[model samples]
Target: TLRAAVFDLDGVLALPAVFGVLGRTEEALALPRGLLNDAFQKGGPEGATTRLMKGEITLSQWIPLMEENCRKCSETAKVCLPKNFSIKEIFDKAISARKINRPMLQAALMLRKKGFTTAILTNTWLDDRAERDGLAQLMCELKMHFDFLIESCQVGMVKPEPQIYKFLLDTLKASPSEVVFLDDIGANLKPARDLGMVTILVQDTDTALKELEKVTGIQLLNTPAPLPTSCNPSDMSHGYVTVKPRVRLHFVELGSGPAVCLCHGFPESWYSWRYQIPALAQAGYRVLAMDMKGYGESSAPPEIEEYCMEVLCKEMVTFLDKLGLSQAVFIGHDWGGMLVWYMALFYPERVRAVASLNTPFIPANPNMSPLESIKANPVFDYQLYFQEPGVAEAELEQNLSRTFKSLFRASDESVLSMHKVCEAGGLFVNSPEEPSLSRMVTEEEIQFYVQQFKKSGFRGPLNWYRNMERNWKWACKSLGRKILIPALMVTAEKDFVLVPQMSQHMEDWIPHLKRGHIEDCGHWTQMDKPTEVNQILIKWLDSDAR
Candidate 1:
């Protein structure tokens, strides 16, 4: 099957009008400036083009050089063409000469009928509405049959640059082997051919069209036919997990109405639920926040398999089992939320109610796992990087004060950027060197995290990444394990760990799920916005008819 052909406008198809050029040069002509022309002509076309393409000479530099030359022969005249003359004025007249070549347009239309996609490749400065409108009108008039049109200036790139070619390939969704290119310029053709695109130079449109037919075996016609257009549907995502205990684990019970089982994310332990436990317990709920298996007061096993969703999910269920609670409302934060989701899926009977703050039940996508999303999303990118063979725990031990300070946020951008990185779907990028801290965290907070990490390094946490696939498999097995119990999600708008998009598919994963979004908070939602977090949980508990 034929793919796409790219055609170059100007010199190949349309020849620009010389009227504007002549008019602009008239100022030079009136003074009869010749030095600039002499200097430019001396550089030769190839040399000047090469220099310009390499960014060796900018427009600002070239214009002044040309202006200086203009003054060289101006022995008597003070009216030297100013260096400040905008490049637009020069291109305006020079570019207008490119009226669409009728023969070329006819030939292009002929190629279209043979089922080849056609595109226009041009280097034009279309900074203003007028230039864009002009190009649009011209393409319409020529009966030009191009599937895609690319402008160098608009995209902040120019042809012969690999970026431009990449842009074309990306837009057309065409392979290098599939695309045949035609351009009059040598510079453009050189890159196109080097990059594996077939090139046809247009000396005469009639001859070029004939050669194109011979090379591609596509017969040309003059008639224009309507091209097919398509509107792409937006992309979407959704995830599921189920908890079944594979091992017995200790469950720490803290607060005192019905039990609120709090699961802390990675890097922290059951101690993370400290702030929430007392508050929720005060409000007549038995608060039970565990120091997840990796962080504090919990066993840090080196087995990566132990962190798999099946194992993690099992741990939550076992916690319930050990506590002798038939069922409890599960609350989780980061990895905690991820655990909560699967726990809800695999052990619906064990969780009477569910709430995950700042954690979304990420439905399976065609990309990497949730841990990978940490790197791709950048905010968690650092954390994801930490999981890499022994990076995070080592880094934490080395930079306890700096790490905690990096964890705290004064302005939202730094934290938000990190979360965005997680949204992008990777643990981390390039290196483990963390970005500068936004502001300092309190000494107490730094000491707290240092103490936690010192107790158990990242082995327990990084295990989560290793178990992702296992988690997915567990989810696959528990697809039927919809939550019969009430489930609620609390996402923080300002929460750095889990952003809004984090919990989009919670309902799909858990049948009966309610959601709450907090506006001003970070990863430490309980510590940062405890009152708001407690109120939402209490309201959901009291209001639920079930």
Candidate 2:
């Protein structure tokens, strides 16, 4: 079991700080690329910079020497160095450019909440400025995310020098095997690895967190913000129940009050509910979010018939029955959102109230088959791709990381115009350019979904699409059904598949419906606009539950 997590200050906690100044410095000095990096790396352990970082020399003593070295190095590279080149200005610019990676900040706090000792280890040349101006300031500005912060300028030890790593271990009272170290530089990681500590090289934040998860066997990315009085269910005891006909399901529960069941959509798991779980729990509700059948840890039946809407609905009813819940307030997003809408329609007795994120209630159309209706509109043609067995599964599973990067991208009108299905290809026939992921989710967050899918395989999830026809038939049974319970429907303005107009007629079918739209948000409403979604959920739930 991992006891502690060690993070490098500059690149890991903050974005690579040097480049911010380096780019501007290079333009100002008229030097080519790699000049500044070369100067810094060659400035050895006993050099002016290292000595400064160790506090053996002050920045006043260090600047002129490093400036002269840069002057000399620029000449060797046949570049003219400006005579007015000042290290102080460039250094200050770089420091000013440093910004905290907020997701990683959340990750660190999450790890601490999970019982891991978290610390920051940095090699820098400033003393209290490191605290008064940099990451230390960021921590104070945005609540402390870590337990301890150590700067080489204050500690008198620099990275790639085993002493700094030792300081972190000693301070945390952790052994090498019990700690996980993450740093952007390879040299810094070498010593930690030599000492038997798990070391993750941070190329991208998401991939690095996934590697940490591999070593510690913890879902760091999926960890939510701590509730006001939160105690997460232990990872080992993900609640398991065999509802009926031996359909075993896995779920997680938090807090204790009126039950609120959270369901996730296709290509997602209970992990998608990360944000709302703690928030709802803190509001004094018994929150239960489960991995739907054929997804996450829930038992995936082999026969396609097992995934039909009626069967899936039966499993949910039995799930609540087995849990001794007479009724629950249901909240769902994406396909999970579709499930909850159906639950309120067919199993109205089991759901006290219903709220859907991004998905709207579509009354059963007796005239059209599911595929026919979907194919009539190119926007939903992607469902056809998922209906074909082994086609989508193989493509998606073949390149798990790439698939996630391509799928979980920020939405815009450009993406909205793309055809979901065409004679040219299926939904994913041609992969689009991958976005930065900072806006949609962290690389680490997507990796959690990737890892879970790797275990359960895409077959189970794809089957949800295969049963579209069967689902249509089941939905037809409630052709004139009107959801009588209080209902909330949130629409994403940019969600092409589930347009806002889809919910325009919902109030007719849902007499007690309350509709809201999230501006500029797409299909991933909860992940895309979590705060807004959470507030809507809390307000509606509080008012109704009261």
Candidate 3:
């Protein structure tokens, strides 16, 4: 359960902030986007703002340095600049124009009601007259939102620094795991995340609140919110149902017939099954695609223990029960594939039939943890980085668009280097930018993923990776068990992560298993070749196997 809610003040709590001021200035000066941010963080690690935040320099001294850096950026970018940038004037205007984020304020109050202490952990200057006045007024205006506030100038520790996060935890008598930290800056959120706090990147107020609700499992957004749509809104209905006491599972449904549940993998939503949802529904099957726990619109329990395979598989049974179905044809992809495999073993009575894409059922060895198994194979080394908390979350959340675009591709050359991705210490090699788009999905689809991730953050998705060893321990009872049901395994020809070779022994394990291959398809088999996948699925269901 959550004990504290720590928030960053400027961008999150109040807006029309430094970035807003910089945006207006950029428009007026005709400068490139992010020019101001680059200039602001000019001196690398020991930058001017960093120094000011650490109390090493007064705001009065930092203003002139910031102005000079702005000039340098304009010169470097080959943009014509105004004779006067007026860094001071722009900032002052922003400070005076600050507006309280009411939704965020309500979220804070909701957290407090749930017995979580709320505090502002911000990097700000309190030395200069203008700085003091602006900050003072804003704090006074929204003083009730927080129980206490910590400013960098007063604390003598800037964000992304271990000390500041530690101080807040110490003050609240809370462990990092018991705290929820929200910030607009990825850099600021990283330190807290590393320290084990549940972190949310505040991109949109509604989305941020939804993420907070997932972590806390509180009904913060009690009123209904609209779901995104490509066709009619009725194409998919976004709704929630209470699965656990505090946990509410969010799902999207289309059509009405015998249930065909679609479970998505890590970092993806019900939206991943968009291509198949309508097709299956039109073929007289009820398509129920859900955002699995700790992903998309699903409630993300913060405890690492909560995400074990046993719990997740049980959730599938519970999900079926909630839908008033005695049994359903469960189809899973990637992590979802792993879940359906477990479900067939642990709760066989609840599953009518099972189909998996990419992920293969590997019998558990009681002696070896999943991490140990992955490390033994250098080609699977990326799992090691994922097993650690905050590492991959920070890396992926740093650039949601680029991360999704690069990962959800069709046999890109970059797939060759994924084995060394963990060793290289990030999802991407040098930058988050990808050179090209994937052959599987369009740019519009990519943008949808980017927007969803920007709201949900990566922590919930990464939590799945962190629970591998735990899952291995929990599934010991099902070590020697076979699926005992009609099964379909759709292997992608180009999926390096889970190659077609991985399913070679499936006939021995699943006696009723039907194996099919999607030629030239990548790891995202269903998405990379949706038409073939749907056709094969329709054919399989029409057969007498079940």
Candidate 4:
């Protein structure tokens, strides 16, 4: 049973407004990004913009405060506002530029068609200038898309406030679990997410629609806008290929030279290599980035046995044979790193050279399963949680957007430090905090990840963990065997999850190893410091190893 599907009017159904208003002011005044946002929030939470959102101040009174803040904060920038800054005129242009997020609106309508109550929760302002700018009429027209519209100004309350969310739940006569909430702001979505309602951050429309589809299990969209990519257009071609019988892999081929096959870890698609793809392509190596088995656009067999190491190795071999490639320079991050190391071990002849970031290779234990090792450490208890097939899947897939937001980032601190032991509920249980999108990734990039995960749930990806003991048994077949292939190990200084110290003894096993360490980088080394990672990789590749 469904109680309601609630969306934030400004960011979810419409493009973000205040963020837009700030954008217009930035352009109109020749200030940098975040200047207007800073201006509004300079003094404290009780600023003029806060009053404006609360309808305490009209457009006329607030525009001057913006001007004053700019005047006060110009020392932080190279330029200040122009002599006659008509903030109102600029704001009109901003609001006029505001367009409906078509994809999300259609999704909301689809939910409505399926007999779900739909509502829009938003904060708005009404003024003579606002009405004159056609803002009032736009609200009237948008009402058709929703059954209930809650306005912050009209209600005297705003988002991120628990009471407003309570009002919504009361009106819908629904439990928090029965409702789904979407908002663009991490701060705004926190309360609803905290209330046990499914909350998605509407960073991009297409991504939000895909996430919504995951929750409802109802097909809401047919035609989706094509995703944008950073790789050079001429160098890219994409399709699916038979990895084996019934298992097809999705890969994007970029540039042309000796083949360079790349793999990404959990919750990541080939797009994780977006920064490295063009870099390697122009450096005279063809980049082959594949969304590994159980990942984006690839086969996601539910059986844990299907994800074992030997199966993956066989699939890669078949993938290569079908493509008519003899060998490739294999590069991977995290789990993909683990795969490349295994490739060197399993089929060294097929790997020309190998490189890994963050993930370190280790000889298999002669006596113990890898799962047993993880179980002994409270720090690695999340793996224990993931061992139960459906438990972790349901927890992680409950809110796809939140999971990605919480997981993907560059930080000096270990993201895993929070999970000492797996709690009884889940990894993300009772925690509603989602860190802001870091500089390491763009909003569009994160949305791409979300959309990909939406197609294949966490079940497929988590299956990789379930096969650890089996993978270890395969590794134990050659306990004394050392990888003789040329390899590069790039470690991160701050990635406590896969610590730099773990790779210290690799030289003993692979005497041909080259090592580089990225300072101040977290677990997501490739994204955190791509330039550093590239520099280390390219310099080594171009060295005597090449």
For candidate 1, which ten residues in a row score worst on lDDT? 230-239
lDDT of 3 by residue, 32-124 (tens): 988987898899767888888888888789989998898898798998667675878877777778878867877787778678889998888
TM-score for each candidate, following the candidate numbering: 0.48, 0.59, 0.56, 0.57
lDDT tens readout by residue for model 1, 246-271: 33233444334677777877666565
**Clash count in backbone of candidate 1:** 43
Best by TM-score: 2
Q: Write down the lDDT of every candidate, Cα atoms only.
A: 0.62, 0.77, 0.79, 0.79
Query: Which 10-residue window in model 2 sums to the lowest lDDT?
Result: 227-236
Measured on C-alpha atoms, candidate 3 has an lDDT of: 0.79
lDDT of 4 at 152: 77
Worst 10 residues of 4 by lDDT: 225-234
Q: For candidate 1, what is the lDDT? A: 0.62
RMSD of each: 23.8, 17.1, 23.7, 18.8
The C-alpha stretches of model 1 lying farther than 4 A from their native spots are 1-255, 365-387, 410-441, 509-512
In candidate 2, stretches whose alpha carbon ends up further than 4 angstroms from where it belongs are 1-237, 413-417, 432-438
lDDT of candidate 2 over 1-546, digit per residue (tens): 788888887778886556446766676666798788777655587677788889888766777788878877887998877667677777766766777886677777777867888888878765344324454445553334577878788888988888887888889888899988888888888999999998889889889888877777778676655432222234423799997664799988876689998888878888777777767875678889899988878888767888887888888998888888999998888878888988988888889899988888888778877677877787776677677688877877877776776666657523323574545464455655453454667777878888788787888888877887788878888877788888899889988778888888887888878877799887777777777777888899988754
Q: At residue 297, give the lDDT of candidate 3.
A: 70
Candidate 3 residue pairs in backbone clash: none
lDDT of 2 at 487: 89
Of the candidates numbered 1 and 2, which has the greater TM-score value? 2
Model 4, clash count? 0
lDDT of 4 by residue, 103-125 (tens): 77777776886899999888776
